[PDB]
Design a protein around this ligand. Structure first.
Ligand code: ZN
Ligand code: ZN
Ligand code: ZN
Lengths: 101, 117, 101, 1131
C-alpha cells in the first residue's frame, strides 16, 4: 500500500487569486503552458491553491507518475477538485490542486 | 517554501486567522475576536513538511560543548575559529532514521560553531 | 432458601465462643431486614421508608449469592473483610468445583 | 601526594572501611526514622488546622510543640519504668515511647474577655521506636553496655518491636513527584501524555496527578487537553490558561512557547487555540471548567467558585496553593505543554518509567509520616466531636478526656504489626507487605531484610519491563540479589554504599539563588526564557539564569564545602535542554564517589594517611566528604557524570577514551549488595548462579545473632562450628560475616563416586559428620497465656488431672510440674505436653487446653520463661532444643548457586583418599559445573587450597587483576600439589587408584534451613476439614496431599478410572445421600427407624441411596442455596 503521504515531500496552501500570475516563481512555466488553452471551467475556480511537492526517490521506488496520481485524485473527488501538474522532467515533482464550484 | 508563523491582532493580542477579500481579491489576516484586519505579506497560509527535512544544526546549542560525557576529537578543527578540540554526537532525535550522522561543536568558549561532516 | 448447618458450620474456637459462618451473618442481615420490612408494611411506615427497606433487602440477598457486584458496596463484616458469598464459594480456583471436586 | 596504583587497592578499601565505620549497613532506616521523629511529627502537628469550635464562647485548641520521651512501660500499678528492647521481646510488649503535645486553649466569649490555658505535655499517643535510633535506649551504648543489657553488639537495629515481634519496614518504590514525565501509550486515545504527580513540600494530601495530553491523530489537527483532578472530563489547555487570568492568545503562547522563531511549535499548538475561541474571558472559562466537572452547579456562580478552588488547590500544589500564584501555575502548566510539544516534535526523548532517577524510595520515616498524618487527623476529628457535644450544652470540657490516645497508638501498632499500610477499617484498600517480620535465620538474612526495597507493581503483572535490571540500578541496587520466584525484579536490595536521602528543606538554596543572579519567575518577561536556563528546585520552576555553567560550578563548590547545600542535595544540569534541576527531597537513592580534578583524583595520599589513624585523630568519613574529595551522586545526577571505573582510567593512554572524567568509583565491587558480597569470584559465575546464591545465603545456617541464648524466637537454627571462609571478599569485613559466619570450609572433591551425588546431590563424610561437621541446634519457642477475660471462663496453668479435666488426651502429663510448666532439661518427644493449661467450664468445672509439642520433633526443653504480658496475666515461653545432625535429604549449598541434598553418607574408610590420607568432607558431581558455568566454585576451591596450605585468607574480591587463576596455580604448585588442584585419589572400597585425577580442595559450604525431617510427611486416615469432609492441609494439621486437577488429567490420560475414583472419591470424602426418584432432590432418611421420605413429593417409598463425594453434596446444597435445582435423576 502506498498513500500520497508515503510519496509526498511537502504540502502547502497558497492564496493564488489568478493562476496566470502564480505566487511561486518556478511554477509559472507549466501553469501557463496548461492555461493557454481552456481545459476546464476557469470561471468555476477558487483562489485557494493547494501545491504539493513530491520527491523523485519515492516516485521512482514505486514506478509512479503524476498521471496516475492526478487520475486517482480526479476519480476519488470527481471534477469538483481540479488538479494540474507538469511533466516528469523538472527538478521538482510538483502538482497543484484547486477546488471547483 | 518555509513555514508560516502565527500573527496576532494589534488590539486584542489574539491570533489572526486567514480570510479572503473578494472585493480586491486579496488575502487578509483578520481577528475573530476584535474587528482588526491586516494585509498579508507571504500569501502562504499552511506548510506541511512531510519529508521533515529539518536542519538539526539549528536544534544544537553551543552550550553542549560543556558536557563532560560527550566525546571530544582533535581530528576535526573548527572552520570558524581554528580550535582543534571539538565535541561530537549523533542526532538522537525521533523522526530521523539516518541518525548515525555526527554533528560537531567547537569547544572554544564564545565561538560555539556547530557543523557536520 | 436458607441452607442447612453443614453448608455454614458454626466452628467453635479455642474457648467456647462459637464463630458463625459468613453465610449465617448474611442470613442474619436478611432476616433482620425481612422482619423490619414485614413490620413496616404491617404498621405505620412511609412509602419511601418501605422503598429503602426493600432496596436494602435486595442488596442483602444479592450480596448473599454474589458479593462482587460492580459499583455497589461490598457486604462488610467485623474486621473490615468482605463476606464470602455463595458465588465466591465456587467461583474459580480453590472453589468447590476446581478446589474440592 | 598522588596515590600510586600500587597503593590504590589499600587506599580505596581504607576509604570504604571508613564509610562503614561512619554509616553502617542500616543507616537509611535510622536516618529515615530520625528525620521522622525530629521533623515530620512536629510538621504534621503544626500543619493541622486549629479546631475552632463554638455554640457565645469559642475555643481554638492549637497544638504547638511535641515531646517524645524515651521508651517507657507502665505496669498495672502505673509506675513508669525504662523498658529495654529485650524485655519487650520477652514480654510481648511494644517498644514504644509516649508522645506528648502542648495544647493551648484560649477562651474568647465577648468584651475582650480573653484568657489562655496551656496544657503542657498532653499525652497524645505512643509511637513505636526503631532500635538503635536516636530515641532508642540502646543509642550510644558501648558493646559492653549492650552486652550488659543482653543485646548483641553486632545487631544493626533498624527495626521495631511490636508485641514482641521484630518488624522491619520495607522501602517502597514510587514515581517521583513534582516532575513532568512525558510518556506515550500505544493503545489510548492520546498520542502523548505529560503527567505530573504534584505534592506540596510538607505533605498534607495525596499526590494530585495532572495530565496534559495530545489527542491522537484521527478534528483537523492534534488537540492538547488537560485532565485536571476532581474533573471527569478533559479540558483544553487554553481554557485552563484563561481560567487562570491569561485570556489573550499572545500571553498564553508567551507562557508556552519561549522561542517565537519556531513555527513548528506554533502550528502544533494552533489546534488548541482554534478549539477555544468562543471562551475568551476568565469567568466563562471557570464556568466551563465547573460544567465539565462531575458536580455541575445549576448556577454558574458556584460553578465558577468550584473551578477557582480546584485551580487554586488541586491543580499543581507544588507550585503553590495560596492565592496570587496563578502566574507561577501558568508558567508551570506552560512548561508541561512545552515538554509535551517537545516530545511530540521529537526534540526530547520520552521519559523512561524505569529510570531510578525518576523514582523515590519511601522509607520508614516518610511511611510513618503518612500513617501519622492520617491518625492525627482522625484524632483531631474525635476531639472535635467530643468537644462539640460539650460546648453545645454551654459548659467547659476536659481536653484530656477529649483525647482518646488509642487512635495514634493502636493505629501505628496495628499497621506495623500486620503490614497492612493504612487505616484498620480500610483493610482492603490498604497495601500489605510493608512492615514484614524481620528475618532472623542468619545475620546476612537480617542485614538484607533491613536493606530490602520493594517495587509495588503487583506480582500478578506479567510485564517484564519493571522486573528488568535497569541500567540505572548500577551502584544503587544489587544486580544479583533478587527472589527467583514470582517477584523477580520487584523486590530489590541496596548496594553496599547506597544511601537513600533523608530529605532537606530547599529554603537555603532558594535564598542563595535569590542573593545570586537568578531571576524569579514572576519578575521576568517571557521573552527572556528563550536563551536563559530554567531552574527547578524540588520540581518547582523558581526562576531563570543566564550563565548556567558557573552557577553549577558555584553550587558544586558550595555542596563540596558543606556550605548551605547539604551533601544529599542533587544538582543536575541538563545542557541540551537548559534546565537545572535541584532536588532536596527524601527517597533519592545515591552513592558516594571520588571527585576527579583535571585528570586526577582529589583523594591524595594525605587523606589515606589520616584515614589509617582513624581511631586516634578522629578523622572520619565525614571529614573526607567535607574535604570535597567525596560526593554523593544520585541516579539522576549520574546521567551528567563521567565516571572512571578505577584511577587507571585517568591515566593518559595511547588513544584517550574520555580525558574529561568527573568522578571515580571507590571500588566497583560496591555495586553488589549484602548477600552478593559474600560470593567469592562472582565475576566468574553465570549471573543466575549469583542470584541463586544471594537467595540461598539467607537460608544458610550460622549464628544469626550473638545473644541467641536469651531470645525466645519461634524458630532458630545455630550451627555448632561456624567457620569464616578461607576464601573471602573484602566486603564481608563490613557485613560482619567473619564474626557471624554461616558455613564451614569443607574439603570438597568434584567426582563421580558411586553415583549417589548425581543430579545436584552430594556425598558427605559420615566420619566428619560424627565429628560435628555441619551439626546444628534447632530452637523452637512455644508461647502460652492463661486468660482471665471474664468470670464466665478462666484459663490457668496447672498440672491437669484425669478426674477433673474433660478434653484430656491420653498422653501422660507427668513431665509437667505443679505449676503446669515443664522444667528445662526434660527430654520431650512428639505429642508430649509442655504446658498444662485448664479452662474453667460454664471432667467437670474445668477442661484441658494444654499445649503439646509440634508433632514429631523430639527435642529437650532448653529453658522456660514466665512473665506477665501487657494486660498482665501469666505468660509463658518454653524453648525446646533439638540437635540436627546432617543426614540424607538435608540441603547444602556452596556460595555459587550449587545446591544439593545429601544423597548418602560414607565413613572415612569408604570415601576416596589422597596419598596423604585426606578424605573429602563432601563429594559433588562434576555434571553440576558445565551447564551452570560456576567457575567461581573451582577458583574458590583452588584459592582455598592455596590459603589452607599457606596460612592466609584468600582474596576473592570480584574485580581484582592482582588475582587470576594462573597466579593461584603457580602458588599451589609451590606447596607440592598439582597446580590445577587435582590429586590422585584412591578408591576407598578397594584402595586402587582412580584413573582420573580428582579435583579436590577446601570450599565454603552452607547448611540450609531445609532439612528433610521438617518436610517428610505421611497420612493414612487422619483428621478432616469441617466444611468439606476432606483431609486437612499441611504437615502441622496431619493433612493429606492434594490430588489436583493436573493429577486428575494425568490419570485420565493413563486411563486409570478406578485409581482416579479412589483418589477423587474414596480416599478423600466418601459419602451417601438419599434421593427422591421423582424430584431428584436429597430426601430425608432415618436409618434407625427405616423411614425415608421426600417432603417435596410427599412420597416415602421411591427413595434411592446414592454414593457421592461429600464435596459434591455440598456443591449441590450450595446451588440449592442459589435457587438452582440440581436434580440427581437415577433413571
Ligand atoms: Zn484582534
Ligand atoms: Zn569554533
Ligand atoms: Zn421428591
Amino acid at each position: 500500500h502506498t498513500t500520497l503521504r508515503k510519496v509526498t515531500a511537502n504540502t502547502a496552501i497558497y492564496y493564488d487569486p489568478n493562476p496566470q500570475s502564480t505566487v511561486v516563481a518556478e511554477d509559472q512555466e507549466w501553469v501557463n503552458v496548461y492555461y493557454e488553452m481552456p481545459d476546464f471551467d476557469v470561471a468555476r475556480i477558487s483562489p485557494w491553491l493547494l501545491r504539493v511537492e513530491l520527491d523523485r526517490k519515492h516516485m521512482t521506488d514505486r514506478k509512479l507518475t503524476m498521471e496516475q496520481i492526478a487520475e486517482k485524485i480526479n476519480a476519488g473527488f470527481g471534477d469538483d477538485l481540479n488538479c494540474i501538474f507538469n511533466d516528469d522532467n523538472a527538478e521538482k515533482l510538483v502538482l497543484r490542486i484547486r477546488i471547483m464550484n | 517554501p518555509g513555514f508560516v508563523g502565527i500573527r496576532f491582532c494589534q488590539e486584542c493580542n489574539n491570533m489572526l486567522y486567514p480570510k479572503e477579500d473578494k472585493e480586491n481579491r486579496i488575502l487578509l489576516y483578520a481577528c475573530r475576536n476584535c474587528d482588526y484586519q491586516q494585509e498579508a505579506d507571504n500569501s502562504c497560509i499552511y506548510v506541511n513538511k512531510i519529508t521533515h527535512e529539518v536542519d538539526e544544526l539549528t536544534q544544537i546549542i553551543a552550550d553542549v560543548s560543556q558536557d563532560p560525557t560527550l566525546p571530544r576529537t582533535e581530528d576535526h578543527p573548527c572552520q570558524k575559529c581554528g580550535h582543534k578540540e571539538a565535541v561530537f554526537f549523533q542526532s538522537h532525535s525521533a523522526r530521523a532514521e539516518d541518525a548515525m550522522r555526527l554533528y560537531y561543536v567547537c569547544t572554544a568558549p564564545h565561538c560555539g560553531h556547530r557543523w557536520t561532516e | 432458601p436458607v441452607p442447612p448447618l453443614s453448608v455454614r458450620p458454626a466452628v467453635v474456637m479455642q474457648g467456647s465462643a462459637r464463630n458463625q459462618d459468613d453465610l449465617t451473618h448474611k442470613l442474619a442481615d436478611i432476616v433482620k431486614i425481612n422482619n423490619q420490612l414485614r413490620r413496616n408494611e404491617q404498621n405505620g411506615a412511609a412509602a419511601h421508608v418501605i422503598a429503602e427497606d426493600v432496596k436494602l433487602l435486595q442488596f442483602h440477598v444479592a450480596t448473599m449469592v454474589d458479593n462482587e457486584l460492580p459499583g455497589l458496596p461490598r457486604a462488610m463484616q467485623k474486621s473490615g473483610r468482605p463476606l464470602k458469598s455463595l458465588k465466591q464459594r465456587l467461583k474459580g480456583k480453590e472453589g468447590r468445583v476446581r478446589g474440592n471436586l | 601526594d598522588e596515590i600510586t596504583p600500587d597503593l590504590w587497592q589499600e587506599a580505596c578499601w581504607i576509604v570504604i572501611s571508613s564509610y562503614f565505620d561512619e554509616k553502617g549497613l542500616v543507616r537509611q532506616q535510622l536516618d529515615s526514622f530520625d528525620e521522622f521523629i525530629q521533623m515530620s511529627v512536629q510538621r504534621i502537628v503544626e500543619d493541622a488546622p486549629p479546631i475552632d469550635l463554638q455554640a457565645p464562647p469559642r475555643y481554638l485548641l492549637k497544638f504547638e510543640q511535641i515531646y517524645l520521651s524515651k521508651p517507657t512501660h507502665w505496669e498495672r500499678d502505673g509506675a513508669p519504668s525504662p523498658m529495654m528492647p529485650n524485655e519487650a521481646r520477652l514480654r510481648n510488649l511494644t517498644y514504644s515511647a509516649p508522645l506528648y503535645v502542648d495544647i493551648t486553649k484560649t477562651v474568647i466569649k465577648e468584651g475582650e474577655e480573653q484568657l489562655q490555658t496551656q496544657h503542657q505535655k498532653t499525652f497524645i499517643g505512643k509511637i513505636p521506636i526503631m532500635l538503635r535510633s536516636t530515641y532508642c535506649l540502646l543509642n550510644g551504648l558501648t558493646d559492653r553496655d549492650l552486652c550488659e543489657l543482653n543485646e548483641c553488639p553486632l545487631d544493626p537495629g533498624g527495626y521495631f518491636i511490636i508485641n514482641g515481634s521484630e518488624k522491619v519496614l520495607i522501602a517502597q518504590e514510587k514515581m517521583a513527584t513534582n516532575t513532568v514525565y512525558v510518556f506515550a501509550k500505544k493503545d489510548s486515545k492520546y498520542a502523548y501524555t505529560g503527567e505530573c504527580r504534584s505534592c506540596l513540600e510538607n505533605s498534607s494530601r495525596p499526590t494530585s496527578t495532572i495530565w496534559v495530553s495530545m489527542l491522537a491523530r484521527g478534528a483537523i489537527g492534534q488537540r492538547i487537553v488537560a485532565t485536571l483532578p476532581y474533573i471527569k472530563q478533559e479540558v483544553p489547555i487554553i481554557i485552563v490558561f484563561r481560567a487562570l487570568g491569561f485570556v489573550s492568545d499572545r500571553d498564553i503562547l508567551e507562557h508556552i512557547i519561549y522561542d517565537f522563531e519556531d513555527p513548528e511549535m506554533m502550528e502544533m499548538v494552533k489546534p488548541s487555540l482554534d478549539e477555544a475561541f468562543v471562551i475568551q474571558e476568565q469567568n466563562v472559562a471557570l464556568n466551563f471548567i465547573g460544567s465539565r466537572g462531575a458536580k455541575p452547579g445549576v448556577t454558574k456562580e458556584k460553578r465558577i467558585k468550584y473551578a477557582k478552588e480546584v485551580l487554586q488547590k488541586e491543580m499543581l500544589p507544588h507550585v503553590g496553593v495560596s492565592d496570587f500564584c496563578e502566574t507561577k501555575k501558568a508558567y508551570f502548566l506552560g512548561y508541561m505543554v512545552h515538554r509535551l510539544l517537545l516530545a511530540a516534535l521529537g526534540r526530547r526523548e520520552l521519559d523512561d518509567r524505569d529510570h531510578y532517577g525518576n523514582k523515590r524510595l519511601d522509607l520508614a520515616g516518610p511511611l510513618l509520616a503518612f500513617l501519622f498524618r492520617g491518625m492525627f487527623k482522625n484524632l483531631l476529628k474525635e476531639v472535635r466531636i467530643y468537644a462539640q457535644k460539650f460546648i453545645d450544652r454551654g459548659k467547659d470540657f476536659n481536653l484530656e478526656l477529649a483525647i482518646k490516645t488509642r487512635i495514634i497508638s493502636d493505629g501505628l501498632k496495628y499497621s506495623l504489626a500486620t503490614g497492612n499500610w493504612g487505616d484498620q477499617k480500610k483493610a482492603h484498600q490498604a497495601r500489605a507487605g510493608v512492615s514484614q517480620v524481620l528475618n532472623r535465620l542468619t545475620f546476612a538474612s537480617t542485614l538484607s531484610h533491613l536493606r530490602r526495597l520493594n517495587s509495588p507493581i503487583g506480582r500478578d503483572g506479567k510485564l517484564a519491563k519493571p522486573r528488568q535490571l535497569h541500567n540505572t540500578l548500577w551502584g544503587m541496587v544489587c544486580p544479583a540479589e533478587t527472589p527467583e520466584g514470582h517477584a523477580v525484579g520487584l523486590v530489590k536490595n541496596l548496594a553496599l554504599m547506597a544511601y537513600i536521602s533523608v530529605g532537606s528543606q530547599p529554603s537555603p538554596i532558594l535564598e542563595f539563588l535569590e542573593e545570586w543572579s537568578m531571576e524569579n519567575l514572576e519578575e521576568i518577561s517571557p521573552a527572556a526564557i528563550a536563551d536563559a536556563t530554567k531552574i527547578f528546585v524540588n520540581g518547582c520552576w523558581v526562576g531563570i539564569h543566564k550563565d548556567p555553567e558557573q552557577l553549577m560550578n558555584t553550587l558544586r563548590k558550595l555542596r563540596r564545602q558543606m556550605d548551605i547545600i547539604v551533601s544529599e542535595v542533587s544538582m543536575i544540569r541538563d545542557i541540551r535542554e537548559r534546565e537545572i534541576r535541584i532536588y532536596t527531597d527524601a527517597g533519592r537513592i545515591c552513592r558516594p564517589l571520588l571527585i576527579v580534578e583535571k585528570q586526577k583524583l582529589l583523594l591524595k595520599k594525605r587523606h589515606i594517611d589520616q584515614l589509617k589513624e582513624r581511631e586516634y585523630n578522629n578523622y572520619s568519613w565525614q571529614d573526607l566528604v567535607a574535604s570535597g574529595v567525596v560526593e554523593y551522586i544520585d541516579t539522576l545526577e549520574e546521567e551528567t557524570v563521567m565516571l572512571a571505573m578505577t584511577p587507571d582510567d585517568l591515566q593518559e593512554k595511547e588513544v584517550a577514551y574520555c580525558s574529561t572524567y568527573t568522578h571515580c568509583e571507590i571500588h566497583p565491587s560496591m555495586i553488589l549488595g549484602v548477600c552478593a558480597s559474600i560470593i567469592p569470584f562472582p565475576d566468574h559465575n553465570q549471573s543466575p548462579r549469583n542470584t541463586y546464591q544471594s537467595a540461598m545465603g539467607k537460608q544458610a545456617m550460622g549464628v544469626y545473632i550473638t545473644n541467641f541464648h536469651v531470645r525466645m524466637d519461634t524458630l532458630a537454627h545455630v550451627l555448632y562450628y561456624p567457620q569464616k571462609p578461607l576464601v573471602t571478599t573484602r566486603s564481608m569485613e563490613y557485613l560482619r560475616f567473619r564474626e557471624l559466619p554461616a558455613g564451614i570450609n569443607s574439603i570438597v572433591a568434584i567426582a563421580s563416586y558411586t553415583g549417589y551425588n548425581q543430579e545436584d546431590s552430594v556425598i558427605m563424610n559420615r566420619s566428619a559428620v560424627d565429628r560435628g561437621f555441619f551439626r546444628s541446634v534447632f530452637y523452637r519457642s512455644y508461647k502460652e497465656q492463661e486468660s482471665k477475660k471474664g468470670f464466665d471462663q478462666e484459663e490457668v496453668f496447672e498440672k491437669p488431672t484425669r478426674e477433673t479435666c474433660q478434653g484430656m488426651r491420653h498422653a501422660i502429663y507427668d513431665k509437667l510440674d505443679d505449676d503446669g510448666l515443664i522444667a528445662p532439661g526434660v527430654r520431650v518427644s512428639g505429642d508430649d505436653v509442655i504446658i498444662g493449661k485448664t479452662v474453667t467450664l460454664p471432667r467437670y468445672t474445668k477442661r484441658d487446653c494444654s499445649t503439646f509439642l509440634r508433632t514429631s520433633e523430639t527435642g529437650i526443653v532448653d529453658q522456660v520463661m514466665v512473665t506477665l504480658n501487657q494486660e498482665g496475666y501469666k505468660f509463658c515461653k518454653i524453648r525446646v532444643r533439638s540437635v540436627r545432625i546432617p543426614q540424607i535429604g538435608d540441603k547444602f549449598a556452596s556460595r555459587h548457586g550449587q545446591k544439593g541434598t545429601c544423597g548418602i553418607q560414607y565413613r572415612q574408610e569408604d570415601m576416596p583418599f589422597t596419598c596423604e590420607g585426606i578424605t573429602p568432607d563432601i563429594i559433588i558431581n562434576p555434571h553440576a559445573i558445565p551447564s551452570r558455568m560456576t567457575i567461581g566454585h573451582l577458583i574458590e576451591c583452588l584459592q582455598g587450597k592455596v590459603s589452607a596450605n599457606k596460612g592466609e585468607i584468600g582474596d576473592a574480591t570480584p574485580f581484582n587483576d592482582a588475582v587470576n587463576v594462573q597466579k593461584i596455580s603457580n602458588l599451589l604448585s609451590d606447596y607440592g600439589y598439582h597446580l590445577r588442584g587435582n590429586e590422585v585419589l584412591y578408591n576407598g572400597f578397594t584402595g586402587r587408584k582412580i584413573t582420573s585425577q580428582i579435583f579436590i580442595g577446601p570450599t565454603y559450604y552452607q547448611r540450609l534451613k531445609h532439612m528433610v525431617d521438617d518436610k517428610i510427611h505421611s497420612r493414612a486416615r487422619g483428621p478432616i476439614q469441617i466444611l468439606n469432609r476432606q483431609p486437612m492441609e499441611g504437615r502441622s494439621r496431619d493433612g493429606g496431599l492434594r490430588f489436583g486437577e493436573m493429577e486428575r488429567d494425568c490419570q485420565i490420560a493413563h486411563g486409570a478410572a478406578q485409581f482416579l475414583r479412589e483418589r477423587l472419591f474414596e480416599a478423600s470424602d466418601p459419602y451417601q445421600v438419599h434421593v427422591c426418584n421423582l424430584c431428584g432432590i436429597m430426601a430425608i432418611a432415618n436409618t434407625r427407624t427405616h423411614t425415608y421420605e421426600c417432603r417435596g413429593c410427599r412420597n416415602k417409598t421411591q427413595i434411592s441411596l446414592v454414593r457421592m463425594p461429600y464435596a459434591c453434596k455440598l456443591l449441590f446444597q450450595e446451588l440449592m442455596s442459589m435457587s438452582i435445582a440440581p436434580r440427581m435423576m437415577s433413571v
